[PDB]
């Protein structure tokens, strides 16, 4: 699809068998979801942005379906204000910015 | 142009008579610039992101050229780690996400 930006670019994703709403975020290197359980091993990591650093759990090689497109990659879980799909998965679904 | 997301989508902008590098950020409602001594009236604001809130100065009706496309609107100035172009100006330049 082509998504304009008058509204927040929120989309439905599927992950770990569950549906969630997430923001397509070209300003994020990584994908960060609100507190949730995911299967498998995770590693502690820290990530930063506006407002500073937070602690997250890093899950590797997680399948995520985004607006019907398949990605498999790193998902960080932690106290993010909103579920964020970052460039690590945006690239996998072929997302570009155009103007 | 078309901008892929393999790397951070940094582009050149012009604002208040300076050229700067800024991140095209579909996740950001607002445009937030690194500290700069911009003339004009401003109002205080608090904006949130990944790690919490920061205090910024809100300036209205500021002309901002993004990769040669003219825009004009609200710009927030404060201790962001990165100059970010948010949706308020991305819409003005006809920027879309496409996959």
């Amino acid at each position: 699809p082509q998504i304009t930006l008058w509204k927040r670019p929120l989309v439905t994703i599927r992950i770990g068998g569950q549906l969630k709403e997430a923001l397509l975020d070209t300003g994020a290197d990584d994908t960060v979801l609100e507190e949730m359980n995911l299967p498998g091993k995770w590693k502690p990591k820290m990530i930063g942005g506006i407002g500073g650093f937070i602690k997250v759990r890093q899950y590797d090689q997680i399948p995520v379906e985004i607006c019907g497109h398949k990605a498999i990659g790193t998902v960080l879980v932690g106290p993010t204000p909103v579920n964020i799909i970052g460039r690590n998965l945006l690239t996998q679904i072929g997302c570009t910015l155009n103007f | 142009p078309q901008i892929t997301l393999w790397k951070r989508p940094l582009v050149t902008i012009r604002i208040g008579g300076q050229l700067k590098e800024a991140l095209l950020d579909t996740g950001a409602d607002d445009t937030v610039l690194e500290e700069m001594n911009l003339p004009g009236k401003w109002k205080p604001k608090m904006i949130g992101g990944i790690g919490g809130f920061i205090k910024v100065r809100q300036y209205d009706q500021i002309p901002v050229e993004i990769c040669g496309h003219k825009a004009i609107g609200t710009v927030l100035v404060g201790p962001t780690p990165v100059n970010i172009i948010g949706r308020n100006l991305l819409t003005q330049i006809g920027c879309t996400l496409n996959f």
């Binding site: 975020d25 290197d29 990584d30 | 996740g27």
Partner: peptide, 4 residues
């Protein structure tokens, strides 16, 4: 930095 990472998540804006």
């Amino acid at each position: 930095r990472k998540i804006l």
